[PDB]
mmCIF file of C-alpha atoms in Angstrom:
data_model
loop_
_atom_site.group_PDB
_atom_site.id
_atom_site.type_symbol
_atom_site.label_atom_id
_atom_site.label_comp_id
_atom_site.label_asym_id
_atom_site.label_seq_id
_atom_site.Cartn_x
_atom_site.Cartn_y
_atom_site.Cartn_z
ATOM 1 C CA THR A 62 0.000 0.000 0.000
ATOM 2 C CA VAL A 63 1.032 3.611 -0.633
ATOM 3 C CA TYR A 64 -0.786 6.177 1.493
ATOM 4 C CA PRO A 65 1.378 9.172 0.532
ATOM 5 C CA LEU A 66 1.981 12.481 2.278
ATOM 6 C CA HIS A 67 -1.287 14.076 3.378
ATOM 7 C CA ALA A 68 -2.233 15.854 0.162
ATOM 8 C CA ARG A 69 -4.859 18.486 0.980
ATOM 9 C CA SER A 70 -3.458 19.673 4.311
ATOM 10 C CA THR A 71 0.207 19.787 5.326
ATOM 11 C CA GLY A 72 2.243 16.579 5.646
ATOM 12 C CA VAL A 73 1.226 13.371 7.440
ATOM 13 C CA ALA A 74 2.306 14.404 10.947
ATOM 14 C CA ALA A 75 -0.418 16.894 11.968
ATOM 15 C CA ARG A 76 -3.533 14.604 11.892
ATOM 16 C CA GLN A 77 -5.817 17.327 13.293
ATOM 17 C CA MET A 78 -9.160 15.747 12.537
ATOM 18 C CA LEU A 79 -12.029 16.591 14.854
ATOM 19 C CA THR A 80 -14.658 14.785 16.893
ATOM 20 C CA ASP A 81 -18.170 15.954 17.689
ATOM 21 C CA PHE A 82 -16.826 17.309 20.969
ATOM 22 C CA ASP A 83 -13.999 18.978 19.036
ATOM 23 C CA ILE A 84 -16.331 20.349 16.351
ATOM 24 C CA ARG A 85 -18.584 21.694 19.091
ATOM 25 C CA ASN A 86 -15.698 23.296 20.983
ATOM 26 C CA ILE A 87 -14.375 24.877 17.783
ATOM 27 C CA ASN A 88 -17.819 26.181 16.850
ATOM 28 C CA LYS A 89 -18.523 27.489 20.361
ATOM 29 C CA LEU A 90 -15.191 29.306 19.996
ATOM 30 C CA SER A 91 -15.401 30.689 16.463
ATOM 31 C CA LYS A 92 -18.925 32.136 16.642
ATOM 32 C CA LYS A 93 -17.687 34.447 19.429
ATOM 33 C CA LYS A 94 -16.403 37.850 18.338
ATOM 34 C CA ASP A 95 -13.984 38.109 21.257
ATOM 35 C CA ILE A 96 -11.815 35.016 20.699
ATOM 36 C CA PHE A 97 -9.617 36.811 18.163
ATOM 37 C CA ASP A 98 -8.142 38.792 21.059
ATOM 38 C CA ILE A 99 -7.556 35.905 23.477
ATOM 39 C CA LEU A 100 -5.401 34.362 20.754
ATOM 40 C CA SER A 101 -2.915 37.074 21.717
ATOM 41 C CA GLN A 102 -2.673 35.507 25.174
ATOM 42 C CA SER A 103 -2.406 32.215 23.308
ATOM 43 C CA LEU A 104 0.706 33.631 21.600
ATOM 44 C CA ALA A 105 2.154 35.678 24.475
ATOM 45 C CA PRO A 106 3.486 33.048 26.904
ATOM 46 C CA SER A 107 6.668 34.835 28.010
ATOM 47 C CA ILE A 108 6.742 38.228 26.312
ATOM 48 C CA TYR A 109 3.824 40.641 26.541
ATOM 49 C CA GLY A 110 2.918 43.575 24.349
ATOM 50 C CA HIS A 111 3.037 43.559 20.541
ATOM 51 C CA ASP A 112 -0.200 41.580 20.384
ATOM 52 C CA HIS A 113 -0.376 42.799 16.787
ATOM 53 C CA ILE A 114 2.597 40.514 16.195
ATOM 54 C CA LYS A 115 0.563 37.703 17.746
ATOM 55 C CA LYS A 116 -2.163 38.528 15.232
ATOM 56 C CA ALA A 117 0.426 38.319 12.463
ATOM 57 C CA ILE A 118 1.604 34.929 13.719
ATOM 58 C CA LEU A 119 -1.896 33.485 13.849
ATOM 59 C CA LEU A 120 -2.664 34.921 10.403
ATOM 60 C CA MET A 121 0.400 33.403 8.763
ATOM 61 C CA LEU A 122 -0.589 30.198 10.570
ATOM 62 C CA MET A 123 -4.008 30.378 8.905
ATOM 63 C CA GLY A 124 -2.354 29.962 5.517
ATOM 64 C CA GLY A 125 -3.858 32.644 3.320
ATOM 65 C CA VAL A 126 -5.945 32.466 0.181
ATOM 66 C CA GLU A 127 -3.183 31.618 -2.295
ATOM 67 C CA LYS A 128 -5.200 31.202 -5.466
ATOM 68 C CA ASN A 129 -4.415 29.274 -8.643
ATOM 69 C CA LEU A 130 -5.139 31.626 -11.530
ATOM 70 C CA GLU A 131 -6.137 29.903 -14.752
ATOM 71 C CA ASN A 132 -3.571 29.772 -17.581
ATOM 72 C CA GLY A 133 -1.256 31.793 -15.338
ATOM 73 C CA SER A 134 0.773 31.694 -12.164
ATOM 74 C CA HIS A 135 -1.006 30.803 -8.969
ATOM 75 C CA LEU A 136 -1.001 34.106 -7.127
ATOM 76 C CA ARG A 137 0.753 34.284 -3.773
ATOM 77 C CA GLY A 138 -1.868 34.500 -1.041
ATOM 78 C CA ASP A 139 0.440 33.420 1.762
ATOM 79 C CA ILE A 140 2.549 35.837 3.782
ATOM 80 C CA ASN A 141 6.090 35.869 5.168
ATOM 81 C CA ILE A 142 6.832 38.194 8.085
ATOM 82 C CA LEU A 143 10.221 39.628 9.043
ATOM 83 C CA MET A 144 11.047 40.336 12.688
ATOM 84 C CA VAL A 145 13.907 42.391 14.103
ATOM 85 C CA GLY A 146 14.675 43.456 17.647
ATOM 86 C CA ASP A 147 16.884 42.531 20.559
ATOM 87 C CA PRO A 148 18.767 39.483 19.196
ATOM 88 C CA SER A 149 19.016 38.204 22.763
ATOM 89 C CA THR A 150 15.475 38.381 24.115
ATOM 90 C CA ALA A 151 13.185 39.343 21.221
ATOM 91 C CA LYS A 152 14.375 36.534 18.962
ATOM 92 C CA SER A 153 14.367 33.747 21.547
ATOM 93 C CA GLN A 154 10.958 34.469 23.058
ATOM 94 C CA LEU A 155 8.945 35.245 19.920
ATOM 95 C CA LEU A 156 10.633 32.347 18.139
ATOM 96 C CA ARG A 157 10.053 29.677 20.773
ATOM 97 C CA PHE A 158 6.399 29.410 19.772
ATOM 98 C CA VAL A 159 6.853 28.787 16.058
ATOM 99 C CA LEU A 160 9.972 26.709 16.712
ATOM 100 C CA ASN A 161 8.711 24.289 19.350
ATOM 101 C CA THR A 162 4.921 24.530 19.225
ATOM 102 C CA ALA A 163 3.055 25.527 16.116
ATOM 103 C CA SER A 164 3.944 23.267 13.161
ATOM 104 C CA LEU A 165 6.347 22.362 10.353
ATOM 105 C CA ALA A 166 8.791 25.148 11.209
ATOM 106 C CA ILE A 167 12.269 24.072 10.154
ATOM 107 C CA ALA A 168 14.677 26.178 12.201
ATOM 108 C CA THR A 169 16.928 28.033 9.833
ATOM 109 C CA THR A 170 19.880 30.119 11.060
ATOM 110 C CA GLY A 171 20.776 31.405 7.586
ATOM 111 C CA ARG A 172 24.370 30.445 6.797
ATOM 112 C CA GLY A 173 24.543 27.516 9.210
ATOM 113 C CA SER A 174 21.151 25.829 8.912
ATOM 114 C CA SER A 175 21.475 26.149 5.155
ATOM 115 C CA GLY A 176 23.425 22.921 5.628
ATOM 116 C CA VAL A 177 24.354 21.760 2.150
ATOM 117 C CA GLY A 178 22.057 24.382 0.644
ATOM 118 C CA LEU A 179 18.815 26.153 1.514
ATOM 119 C CA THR A 180 17.706 26.382 -2.111
ATOM 120 C CA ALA A 181 19.212 23.361 -3.906
ATOM 121 C CA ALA A 182 22.468 22.083 -5.390
ATOM 122 C CA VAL A 183 23.457 19.665 -8.132
ATOM 123 C CA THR A 184 25.479 16.907 -6.486
ATOM 124 C CA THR A 185 27.331 14.254 -8.469
ATOM 125 C CA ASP A 186 28.131 11.561 -5.918
ATOM 126 C CA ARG A 187 30.801 8.857 -5.939
ATOM 127 C CA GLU A 188 28.285 6.484 -4.340
ATOM 128 C CA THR A 189 26.244 5.813 -7.468
ATOM 129 C CA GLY A 190 28.588 8.013 -9.512
ATOM 130 C CA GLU A 191 25.560 10.053 -10.533
ATOM 131 C CA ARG A 192 24.106 13.536 -10.097
ATOM 132 C CA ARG A 193 20.954 14.255 -8.110
ATOM 133 C CA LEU A 194 19.590 17.394 -6.477
ATOM 134 C CA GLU A 195 19.923 18.682 -2.932
ATOM 135 C CA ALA A 196 16.590 20.299 -2.179
ATOM 136 C CA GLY A 197 16.887 22.529 0.855
ATOM 137 C CA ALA A 198 14.687 21.832 3.848
ATOM 138 C CA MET A 199 12.448 24.806 3.055
ATOM 139 C CA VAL A 200 11.988 23.650 -0.532
ATOM 140 C CA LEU A 201 11.782 20.095 0.780
ATOM 141 C CA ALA A 202 8.972 21.459 2.935
ATOM 142 C CA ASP A 203 5.448 21.558 1.511
ATOM 143 C CA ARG A 204 2.937 24.040 2.727
ATOM 144 C CA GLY A 205 4.668 24.693 6.057
ATOM 145 C CA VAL A 206 5.884 27.841 7.775
ATOM 146 C CA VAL A 207 9.671 27.808 7.887
ATOM 147 C CA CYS A 208 11.392 29.859 10.577
ATOM 148 C CA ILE A 209 14.684 31.510 9.622
ATOM 149 C CA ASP A 210 16.434 32.963 12.640
ATOM 150 C CA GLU A 211 19.715 34.881 12.361
ATOM 151 C CA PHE A 212 18.776 36.065 8.876
ATOM 152 C CA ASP A 213 21.652 38.562 8.677
ATOM 153 C CA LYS A 214 24.069 35.594 8.644
ATOM 154 C CA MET A 215 23.242 34.568 5.074
ATOM 155 C CA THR A 216 25.878 33.613 2.571
ATOM 156 C CA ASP A 217 25.826 35.902 -0.453
ATOM 157 C CA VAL A 218 24.410 33.367 -2.916
ATOM 158 C CA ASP A 219 21.519 32.806 -0.501
ATOM 159 C CA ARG A 220 20.293 36.391 -0.944
ATOM 160 C CA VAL A 221 18.516 35.537 -4.213
ATOM 161 C CA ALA A 222 16.519 32.454 -3.170
ATOM 162 C CA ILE A 223 14.217 34.650 -1.071
ATOM 163 C CA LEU B 25 9.706 54.885 -12.839
ATOM 164 C CA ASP B 26 6.447 54.305 -10.971
ATOM 165 C CA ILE B 27 5.001 57.779 -10.498
ATOM 166 C CA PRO B 28 2.789 57.391 -7.410
ATOM 167 C CA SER B 29 -0.566 58.470 -8.837
ATOM 168 C CA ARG B 30 -4.166 57.910 -7.779
ATOM 169 C CA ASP B 31 -6.059 56.521 -10.765
ATOM 170 C CA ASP B 32 -3.455 53.760 -11.074
ATOM 171 C CA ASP B 33 -3.711 52.642 -7.450
ATOM 172 C CA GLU B 34 -7.462 52.799 -8.029
ATOM 173 C CA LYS B 35 -7.884 50.882 -11.277
ATOM 174 C CA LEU B 36 -4.982 48.440 -10.935
ATOM 175 C CA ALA B 37 -5.947 47.548 -7.374
ATOM 176 C CA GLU B 38 -9.644 47.310 -8.208
ATOM 177 C CA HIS B 39 -8.893 45.021 -11.102
ATOM 178 C CA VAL B 40 -6.545 42.779 -9.125
ATOM 179 C CA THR B 41 -9.291 42.426 -6.532
ATOM 180 C CA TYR B 42 -11.641 41.789 -9.460
ATOM 181 C CA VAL B 43 -9.302 39.006 -10.558
ATOM 182 C CA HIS B 44 -9.868 37.644 -7.071
ATOM 183 C CA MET B 45 -13.580 37.986 -7.846
ATOM 184 C CA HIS B 46 -13.465 36.901 -11.489
ATOM 185 C CA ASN B 47 -10.319 34.984 -12.262
ATOM 186 C CA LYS B 48 -10.216 36.523 -15.754
ATOM 187 C CA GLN B 49 -8.638 39.947 -16.138
ATOM 188 C CA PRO B 50 -10.390 40.084 -19.572
ATOM 189 C CA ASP B 51 -13.349 42.432 -19.209
ATOM 190 C CA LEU B 52 -16.476 42.682 -21.402
ATOM 191 C CA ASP B 53 -14.392 43.340 -24.549
ATOM 192 C CA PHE B 54 -11.476 40.920 -24.649
ATOM 193 C CA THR B 55 -10.365 37.728 -26.390
ATOM 194 C CA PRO B 56 -7.816 35.958 -24.181
ATOM 195 C CA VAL B 57 -5.997 33.081 -25.847
ATOM 196 C CA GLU B 58 -4.934 30.012 -23.906
ATOM 197 C CA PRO B 59 -1.125 29.786 -23.893
ATOM 198 C CA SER B 60 -1.103 26.388 -25.623
ATOM 199 C CA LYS B 61 -2.803 27.320 -28.885
ATOM 200 C CA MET B 62 -1.303 30.787 -28.496
ATOM 201 C CA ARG B 63 2.093 29.084 -28.649
ATOM 202 C CA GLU B 64 0.851 27.089 -31.624
ATOM 203 C CA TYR B 65 -0.001 30.190 -33.644
ATOM 204 C CA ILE B 66 3.181 31.902 -32.458
ATOM 205 C CA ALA B 67 5.426 29.106 -33.690
ATOM 206 C CA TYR B 68 3.464 28.979 -36.938
ATOM 207 C CA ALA B 69 4.271 32.658 -37.391
ATOM 208 C CA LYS B 70 7.889 31.903 -36.508
ATOM 209 C CA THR B 71 7.941 29.497 -39.463
ATOM 210 C CA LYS B 72 7.377 32.239 -42.060
ATOM 211 C CA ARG B 73 10.525 34.363 -42.604
ATOM 212 C CA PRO B 74 9.028 37.451 -44.299
ATOM 213 C CA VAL B 75 10.931 39.825 -46.577
ATOM 214 C CA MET B 76 11.956 43.457 -46.202
ATOM 215 C CA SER B 77 9.946 45.838 -48.377
ATOM 216 C CA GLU B 78 11.919 48.084 -50.706
ATOM 217 C CA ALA B 79 9.838 51.244 -50.338
ATOM 218 C CA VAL B 80 10.150 51.763 -46.579
ATOM 219 C CA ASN B 81 13.968 51.732 -46.704
ATOM 220 C CA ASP B 82 14.391 55.459 -47.284
ATOM 221 C CA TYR B 83 11.945 56.216 -44.481
ATOM 222 C CA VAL B 84 13.712 53.658 -42.289
ATOM 223 C CA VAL B 85 17.038 55.182 -43.307
ATOM 224 C CA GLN B 86 15.773 58.672 -42.564
ATOM 225 C CA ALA B 87 14.477 57.515 -39.191
ATOM 226 C CA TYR B 88 17.965 56.308 -38.314
ATOM 227 C CA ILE B 89 19.462 59.633 -39.376
ATOM 228 C CA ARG B 90 17.046 61.439 -37.093
ATOM 229 C CA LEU B 91 17.612 58.984 -34.263
ATOM 230 C CA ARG B 92 21.296 59.682 -34.837
ATOM 231 C CA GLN B 93 21.498 63.455 -34.896
ATOM 232 C CA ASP B 94 19.355 64.249 -31.855
ATOM 233 C CA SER B 95 21.412 61.684 -29.957
ATOM 234 C CA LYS B 96 24.522 63.825 -30.388
ATOM 235 C CA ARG B 97 22.739 66.919 -29.087
ATOM 236 C CA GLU B 98 21.405 64.684 -26.297
ATOM 237 C CA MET B 99 24.708 63.062 -25.251
ATOM 238 C CA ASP B 100 25.439 65.165 -22.160
ATOM 239 C CA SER B 101 21.793 66.252 -21.999
ATOM 240 C CA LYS B 102 18.990 64.863 -19.830
ATOM 241 C CA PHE B 103 18.036 61.681 -21.707
ATOM 242 C CA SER B 104 21.611 60.470 -21.672
ATOM 243 C CA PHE B 105 21.085 57.469 -23.943
ATOM 244 C CA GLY B 106 24.341 58.068 -25.745
ATOM 245 C CA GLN B 107 24.909 57.991 -29.487
ATOM 246 C CA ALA B 108 22.361 55.547 -30.853
ATOM 247 C CA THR B 109 24.305 52.967 -32.821
ATOM 248 C CA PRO B 110 23.841 51.143 -36.123
ATOM 249 C CA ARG B 111 22.736 48.257 -33.936
ATOM 250 C CA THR B 112 19.731 50.394 -33.030
ATOM 251 C CA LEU B 113 18.920 50.729 -36.728
ATOM 252 C CA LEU B 114 19.304 46.994 -37.202
ATOM 253 C CA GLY B 115 17.098 46.340 -34.186
ATOM 254 C CA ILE B 116 14.426 48.602 -35.629
ATOM 255 C CA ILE B 117 14.569 46.636 -38.857
ATOM 256 C CA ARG B 118 14.301 43.379 -36.943
ATOM 257 C CA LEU B 119 11.305 44.670 -34.995
ATOM 258 C CA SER B 120 9.612 45.650 -38.245
ATOM 259 C CA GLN B 121 10.309 42.207 -39.674
ATOM 260 C CA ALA B 122 8.790 40.537 -36.621
ATOM 261 C CA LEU B 123 5.693 42.724 -36.826
ATOM 262 C CA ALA B 124 5.368 41.701 -40.464
ATOM 263 C CA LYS B 125 5.546 38.128 -39.196
ATOM 264 C CA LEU B 126 2.597 39.025 -36.988
ATOM 265 C CA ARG B 127 0.937 40.173 -40.203
ATOM 266 C CA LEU B 128 1.880 36.770 -41.653
ATOM 267 C CA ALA B 129 2.772 38.862 -44.713
ATOM 268 C CA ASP B 130 6.024 38.755 -46.664
ATOM 269 C CA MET B 131 6.233 42.530 -47.236
ATOM 270 C CA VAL B 132 6.812 44.948 -44.379
ATOM 271 C CA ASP B 133 4.319 47.805 -44.213
ATOM 272 C CA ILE B 134 5.057 51.479 -43.745
ATOM 273 C CA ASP B 135 2.642 51.287 -40.824
ATOM 274 C CA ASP B 136 4.661 48.305 -39.598
ATOM 275 C CA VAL B 137 7.973 50.144 -39.364
ATOM 276 C CA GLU B 138 6.124 53.217 -38.107
ATOM 277 C CA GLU B 139 4.804 51.120 -35.235
ATOM 278 C CA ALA B 140 8.346 49.923 -34.611
ATOM 279 C CA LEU B 141 9.467 53.545 -34.392
ATOM 280 C CA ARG B 142 6.613 54.228 -31.987
ATOM 281 C CA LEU B 143 7.899 51.398 -29.808
ATOM 282 C CA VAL B 144 11.464 52.640 -29.849
ATOM 283 C CA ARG B 145 10.481 56.208 -29.007
ATOM 284 C CA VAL B 146 7.910 55.327 -26.348
ATOM 285 C CA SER B 147 10.857 53.759 -24.553
ATOM 286 C CA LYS B 148 12.114 57.340 -24.477
ATOM 287 C CA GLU B 149 10.706 60.423 -22.745
ATOM 288 C CA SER B 150 8.972 58.049 -20.334
ATOM 289 C CA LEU B 151 11.210 59.523 -17.625
ATOM 290 C CA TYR B 152 9.669 62.869 -16.678
ATOM 291 C CA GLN B 153 6.932 65.325 -17.538
ATOM 292 C CA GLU B 154 5.664 63.165 -20.424
ATOM 293 C CA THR B 155 3.976 66.207 -21.975
ATOM 294 C CA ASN B 156 4.322 68.722 -24.788
ATOM 295 C CA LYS B 157 2.529 71.842 -26.048
ATOM 296 C CA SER B 158 1.185 73.532 -29.183
ATOM 297 C CA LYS B 159 1.121 77.237 -30.046
ATOM 298 C CA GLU B 160 0.943 77.590 -33.835
ATOM 299 C CA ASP B 161 -2.802 76.886 -34.150
ATOM 300 C CA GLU B 162 -4.156 80.441 -34.431
ATOM 301 C CA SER B 163 -2.005 82.063 -37.135
ATOM 302 C CA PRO B 164 -4.535 84.532 -38.516
ATOM 303 C CA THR B 165 -1.857 87.142 -39.228
ATOM 304 C CA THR B 166 1.273 85.407 -37.979
ATOM 305 C CA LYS B 167 0.922 83.110 -40.989
ATOM 306 C CA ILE B 168 1.102 86.143 -43.267
ATOM 307 C CA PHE B 169 4.146 87.195 -41.252
ATOM 308 C CA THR B 170 5.875 83.862 -41.810
ATOM 309 C CA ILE B 171 5.131 84.028 -45.534
ATOM 310 C CA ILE B 172 6.720 87.480 -45.498
ATOM 311 C CA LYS B 173 9.668 85.961 -43.652
ATOM 312 C CA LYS B 174 10.213 83.366 -46.366
ATOM 313 C CA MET B 175 10.081 86.219 -48.880
ATOM 314 C CA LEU B 176 12.725 88.004 -46.805
ATOM 315 C CA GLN B 177 14.845 84.855 -46.862
ATOM 316 C CA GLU B 178 14.604 85.267 -50.625
ATOM 317 C CA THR B 179 15.608 88.951 -50.831
ATOM 318 C CA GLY B 180 15.257 90.679 -47.445
ATOM 319 C CA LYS B 181 13.670 94.071 -48.168
ATOM 320 C CA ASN B 182 11.181 96.187 -46.183
ATOM 321 C CA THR B 183 9.790 97.842 -49.318
ATOM 322 C CA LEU B 184 7.021 100.432 -49.615
ATOM 323 C CA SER B 185 5.325 98.742 -52.603
ATOM 324 C CA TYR B 186 3.777 95.298 -52.082
ATOM 325 C CA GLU B 187 2.722 93.480 -55.253
ATOM 326 C CA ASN B 188 4.212 89.988 -54.945
ATOM 327 C CA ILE B 189 3.222 90.011 -51.277
ATOM 328 C CA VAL B 190 -0.422 90.738 -52.089
ATOM 329 C CA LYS B 191 -0.316 88.137 -54.869
ATOM 330 C CA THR B 192 1.001 85.452 -52.529
ATOM 331 C CA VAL B 193 -1.558 86.483 -49.900
ATOM 332 C CA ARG B 194 -4.393 86.098 -52.398
ATOM 333 C CA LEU B 195 -2.949 82.719 -53.377
ATOM 334 C CA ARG B 196 -2.921 81.857 -49.675
ATOM 335 C CA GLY B 197 -6.600 82.806 -49.542
ATOM 336 C CA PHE B 198 -6.257 85.399 -46.790
ATOM 337 C CA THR B 199 -8.169 88.538 -47.660
ATOM 338 C CA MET B 200 -6.703 91.936 -48.456
ATOM 339 C CA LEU B 201 -8.379 93.805 -45.596
ATOM 340 C CA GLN B 202 -6.756 91.552 -42.998
ATOM 341 C CA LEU B 203 -3.508 91.808 -44.965
ATOM 342 C CA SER B 204 -3.643 95.611 -44.907
ATOM 343 C CA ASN B 205 -4.495 95.553 -41.201
ATOM 344 C CA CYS B 206 -1.456 93.369 -40.514
ATOM 345 C CA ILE B 207 0.722 95.594 -42.700
ATOM 346 C CA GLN B 208 -0.438 98.545 -40.612
ATOM 347 C CA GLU B 209 0.416 96.671 -37.436
ATOM 348 C CA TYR B 210 3.898 95.671 -38.583
ATOM 349 C CA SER B 211 4.759 99.088 -40.011
ATOM 350 C CA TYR B 212 3.767 100.424 -36.612
ATOM 351 C CA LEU B 213 5.708 97.466 -35.221
ATOM 352 C CA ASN B 214 8.582 98.963 -37.238
ATOM 353 C CA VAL B 215 9.505 96.211 -39.678
#
């Protein structure tokens, strides 16, 4: 049997189907106008303030409305948000949600976590004596939200992949 | 250079959002072609190899000359595209040939190469102002004056007996009362 990667949603790991209790909890939540604000407390475990940033996080977690235009490019409906602040405290705290908690967030330091290559690289190996591709983790990722900390530590050739 | 205007950010944005509404930018009057059969027709055109028409040459040539001379008096000037080259001429010819391909015709049209010139010049002056003016519309007596000026280029006399002047005015159609009025004005204007 071949049950491949979960096609419609993100990869196989999430499995966030719902039960009647879960559907009822989600409905009881969503129909309430106020919940959008408590999400800020849901994304402010250690730092406080900048709840607008919490809104941004939950939005970019939603996914967007990236639409496939006929006979043309699928328009980008997803969003990528840059953050900059105290490299000591701002980065660690705001990161530690998307890193540890949310989902499918490959930690990316820039130069280092590029590994072999963030984008790709043609590699002709002695093992089979043949050339394949090295797809970076982000491009290996499908539908996720990749976190790139320490962005200013990019190698020069990286600056174009973005 | 994206001049930040208002009607652009209105229409462009509206129509992008309309794309989100209706996934076809084509409005009521439009014939969008799917890229597949578009490609088909395009390649078919590419398999034609039209011929350069003999008449347009002079015009083409003259165009080049113009596109040359101005360039010199525009070298250090604002639009610093320096010294348009024979490659520009050749590119114009190639553009005309491709438009004739779009005609699927083996003879390039004067309108064809004129459109090519329009393309090459619209690339220019798209930097700033993008406007011009006109003054010579009225000419109810200034036209008489310019005719007189050509006559002066011939000889250059401020005579007191006008017989070829009145003849050329009558040929021009302008009446003799307006002519005499203008003569009054310019004699008073001391010419």
